[PDB]
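Archive entry. Fields below.
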Amino acid sequence: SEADRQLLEAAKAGDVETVKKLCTVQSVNCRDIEGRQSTPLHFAAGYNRVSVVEYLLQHGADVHAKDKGGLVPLHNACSYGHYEVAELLVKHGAVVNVADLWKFTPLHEAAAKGKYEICKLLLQHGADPTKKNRDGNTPLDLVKDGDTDIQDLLR
Amino acid sequence: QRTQPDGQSFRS
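PREDICTED_STRUCTURE:
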């Protein structure tokens, strides 16, 4: 519907005032049907819209909602290096060892994308560096050659 | 096949 479509666009743009205007109990966890079924929190998280992320969480956004590929907003935060966002989600109860349809964890995302401090954050909250995805790869397996500091951290 | 999360690394 149009209202949900606009909410999603606002959460993506970081347009707080429009979020405040369209976020109802009915719509706060709506899903983008045309894409990979992201929720407003997925978008706010993936696009590093901290205020929107805070607002949505405070107004009942589901920190554990999986999209079409089985991603939770923490995946989005971790893959794109949004540290504060990652911290917000974790502090609000996000499961760190959560796994998508391919058994990728946020730690797989953060490791493959070369985000050290995010990897560290995940490890401090008990992320398992030994978890394998569908390809039989640990997050360590996914680390670029240059990122020896991340290899060391995961090891 | 597996595609990227909604989002991007850089706000600019």
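CURATOR_NOTE: The domain at 1-155 of chain A is CATH 1.25.40.20 (Serine Threonine Protein Phosphatase 5, Tetratricopeptide repeat).
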